[PDB]
């Protein structure tokens, strides 16, 4: 078995690993050489005697082919080979990406992982070990599993890091950490036709707004709240909250809470230190009666603590020394919570201690009696730090104990944090990175209630750590370069920032994909994947009703534009108007024609998830003076921090089979704004619409077309006598 060169990999910009056929004899710099002006500085055989780390005097140029030459290499224990020649490049040519499919979950949801090669295909036989920083919040598959089997499961609302250590079939290990956020699936409150409010001024404008919003039928003991209640009449939503003038109210559980009518307003008062269901009976002038029930809750009171981690993995030291957050120490947050799990100032009644029985762990930022005082009881939060001791490689745990009364000998509860200290060398060679970037950017982030999603990533802001060959952390570093791989129609990199291009992606993006970003830090480049989405409900597809349309104009009227024909003529006689905001909020239930004067609209539009977007007469907040239905959202776009470019459509269409009767007229080639003109009764125009594109107004008729195939529609327009 005679020394041959099997692999040559640029492990960083000044270091190259050369792997051989067999075990070899002890070697130094004199044994190796490198072309293109570089000189070899050092050469160190591993303990596996199977490879040699060779460091070069000066960084490799990206994408330059170099040739290593090995002279005088001895085998196992005998013979010396002739000159060996090995080429290599320093670039991330055949990188493998590791991606968490979905990093914002609701409770109950799950997410898989995706591992792909340079050609974008799944890596067969790839394995992964996941681990969660906080298993109260996120839980993961145990042990080592196939990548396609791996699962991250959402358990409780909040936050967790999930380390993914992936083993490729050829034995390479890639390690990265993901940021996972779990949000609550909000509890469905029994709908009682009211909601509890500070004052009537900040209440929903009408019955439709009320049914759309979150309802509050709870209050704390010691409060009073005003009742905002909403009726419909003949199925039609009312236009203002119910008025309690001349009504009388009876309190059915007056020990718990009481009610009083003061002019138009009904005010419920919850009594101190009471709780449970309290009901009321209202009697109106008209001899109708109704009841309703409010949940009174105990006042909030300190109940328990919460810690922001369940396990921590630390390196025994940091390269360069010191105590470095993320490498050889970890800061842990502790929060004080009430009986409903909300933050509450810590008292001075109780105490919390932080302790370990594990030699080699050090607790800092803690009082000498092991307590943490929560800014002497004024704060709902506090913190401590755990630190590894150099070269003491022990795994143990930290206990965080809450005592109801400071003087109690037994704790009321105990939270446990497991801690694993791994050994790293003070002079370890860095060979990879852990870049803790968020998994996903969403162009709609600024409009989502969640404050956790982002519409960009600044890579100068993300924790990045260098790793040794074992996958353990060495040092905190910052990026030297960031660059997009390939091109993409929706996103780009500018400096160190991944972001949306700005060409109206909010209104126009209806797909989702993943982009790759090469990030260089400390002479190492890593390819990291990022998904982009758009959770806005914007038009993605449209459909045209096919059946012939006949419009009979009133003897009073002459004209119908194409925009009116296609999208409809609004008829306010069929709609409900909120006078307070001068907008329509509904189609009456008695409506003879879905809210439209002539024919019903021809176009039905959907969003990316397949849901119908309300259009025309169904747009909540449609202005009082709207004349046609070419609209898919509120003109003023109430509620949005970031607006759509345009809430209307444009259409590409042609006109065929024109037949005019009497004085009827119409253009040979109209736009949306041109009109069918009929002067006398008996005048008519007949024709066929060929609709070719439908798209958001101002966008592109080809690229943003919502219509899969063109469609033809026969139309007749006559005038009544």
């Amino acid at each position, epitope marked *: 078995a005679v020394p041959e060169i099997v692999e040559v990999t640029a492990v960083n910009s000044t270091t190259v690993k050369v792997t051989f056929n067999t075990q070899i004899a002890d070697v130094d710099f004199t044994n190796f050489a490198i072309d293109n002006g570089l000189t070899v500085t050092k050469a160190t055989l591993s303990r596996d005697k199977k490879s040699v780390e060779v460091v070069v005097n000066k960084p490799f140029t990206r994408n330059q082919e170099y040739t290593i030459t090995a002279t005088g290499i001895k085998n196992l224990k005998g013979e010396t080979a002739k000159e060996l020649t090995g080429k290599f490049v320093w670039s991330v040519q055949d990188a493998v990406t590791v991606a968490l499919n979905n990093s914002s979950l609701k409770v109950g949801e799950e997410s898989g992982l995706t591992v792909k090669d340079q050609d974008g295909k799944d890596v067969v036989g790839a394995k992964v070990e996941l681990t969660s920083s906080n298993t109260n919040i996120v839980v993961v598959s145990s042990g080592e599993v196939s990548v396609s089997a791996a699962k991250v499961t959402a358990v409780k609302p909040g936050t967790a890091d999930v380390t993914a250590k992936v083993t490729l079939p050829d034995g390479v290990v890639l390690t990265n950490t993901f940021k996972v956020t779990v949000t609550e699936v909000p509890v469905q409150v029994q709908n009682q036709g009211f909601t509890l409010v500070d004052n009537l001024s900040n209440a929903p404008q009408n*019955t439709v707004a009320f049914n759309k919003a979150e309802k509050v039928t709870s209050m704390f003991a010691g409060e009073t709240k005003t009742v905002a209640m909403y009726d419909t*009449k003949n199925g039609d939503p009312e236009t203002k909250p119910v008025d309690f003038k001349d009504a009388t109210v009876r309190s059915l559980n007056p020990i718990i809470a009481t009610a009083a009518i003061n002019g138009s307003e009904l005010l419920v008062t919850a009594n101190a230190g009471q709780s449970g269901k309290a009901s009321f009976e209202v009697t109106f002038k008209d001899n109708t009666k109704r009841t309703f029930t409010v949940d009174v809750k105990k006042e909030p009171v300190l109940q328990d603590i919460k810690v922001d981690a369940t396990s921590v993995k630390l390196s025994d030291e940091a390269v360069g020394g010191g105590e470095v957050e993320g490498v050889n120490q970890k800061t842990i947050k502790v929060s004080a919570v009430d009986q409903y799990g909300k933050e509450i100032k810590f008292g001075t009644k109780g105490k919390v201690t932080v302790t370990t029985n594990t030699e080699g762990l050090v607790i800092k930022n803690v009082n000498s009696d092991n307590t943490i005082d929560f800014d002497s009881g004024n704060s709902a939060t506090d913190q401590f730090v755990v630190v590894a001791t150099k070269d003491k490689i022990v795994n143990g745990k930290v206990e965080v104990k809450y005592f109801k009364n400071a003087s109690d000998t037994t704790p009321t509860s105990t939270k446990t944090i497991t801690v694993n200290v791994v050994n790293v060398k003070a002079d370890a060679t860095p060979v990879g990175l852990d870049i803790v970037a968020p998994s996903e950017i969403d162009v709609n982030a600024p409009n989502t209630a969640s404050t956790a999603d982002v519409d960009f990533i600044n890579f100068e802001s993300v924790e990045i750590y260098t790793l040794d060959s074992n996958g353990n952390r060495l040092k905190k570093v910052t990026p030297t370069a960031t660059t997009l791989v390939g091109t993409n129609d929706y996103v780009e990199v500018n400096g160190n920032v991944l972001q949306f291009k700005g060409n109206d992606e909010l209104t126009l993006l209806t797909s989702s994909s993943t982009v790759n970003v090469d990030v260089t830090a400390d002479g190492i480049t890593k390819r990291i994947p990022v998904k982009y989405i758009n959770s806005a409900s914007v038009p993605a597809s449209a459909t045209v009703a096919t059946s012939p349309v006949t419009v009979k104009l009133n003897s009073s009227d002459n004209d119908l534009t194409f925009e009116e024909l296609i999208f409809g003529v609004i008829d306010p006689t069929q709609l409900v108007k909120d006078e307070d905001i001068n907008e329509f909020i509904a189609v009456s239930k*008695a409506a003879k024609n879905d809210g439209y004067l002539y024919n019903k609209p021809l176009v039905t539009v959907k969003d990316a998830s397949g849901e119908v977007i309300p259009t025309g007469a169904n747009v909540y907040g449609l202005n009082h003076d709207a004349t046609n239905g070419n609209i898919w959202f509120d003109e003023e776009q109430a509620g949005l921090a970031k607006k759509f470019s345009d809430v209307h459509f444009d259409v590409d269409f042609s006109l065929a089979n024109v037949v005019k009767t009497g004085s009827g007229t119409v253009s040979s080639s109209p736009s949306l704004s041109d009109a069918i003109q009929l002067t006398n009764s008996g005048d008519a125009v007949s024709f066929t619409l060929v609709i070719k594109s439908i798209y958001v107004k101002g966008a592109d008729k080809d690229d943003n077309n919502l219509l899969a195939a063109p469609v033809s529609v026969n139309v007749t327009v006559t005038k009544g006598s």
Partner: nanobody, 124 residues
Framework: QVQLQESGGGLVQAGGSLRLSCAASGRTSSAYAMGWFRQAPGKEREFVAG????????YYGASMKGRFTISRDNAKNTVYLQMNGLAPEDTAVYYC?????????????????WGQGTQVTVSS
């Protein structure tokens, strides 16, 4: 989609007391506000009383509360109309109705699902 089945109709003498029941079948049928209507002979259909999905709220037609009381058993997903102190003008087909929404609506148009009715007849 929901289905409603009434029970407990029949003959009763003036001054007496009867209970009607209506059981709701479906998938998220638990989530349905329900109500009672009636059509007496010679008269137009009229609203009697209504209840929220979990019985926290009820409402009544003018002058109907007393003579009538609505309640609900959530476990059985059934709703009950209790009639006390009946008189000949309560002779009627009593219908159960259900709705997607709860907003104190006392008209037919506030309700999208109907049972088929039961007859209640009141002697002298």
């Amino acid at each position: 989609q929901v289905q409603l089945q009434e029970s407990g109709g029949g003959l009763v003498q003036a001054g007496g007391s009867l209970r009607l029941s209506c059981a709701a079948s479906g998938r998220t049928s638990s989530a349905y506000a329900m109500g009672w209507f009636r059509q007496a002979p010679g008269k137009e259909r009229e609203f009697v009383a209504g209840i929220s999905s979990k019985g926290g709220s009820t409402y009544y037609g003018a002058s109907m509360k007393g003579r009538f009381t609505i309640s609900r058993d959530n476990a059985k997903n059934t709703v009950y109309l209790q009639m006390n102190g009946l008189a000949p003008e309560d002779t009627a087909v009593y219908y159960c109705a259900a709705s997607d929404k709860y907003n104190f609506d006392t008209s037919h148009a506030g309700y999208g699902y109907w049972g088929q009715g039961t007859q209640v007849t009141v002697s002298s």
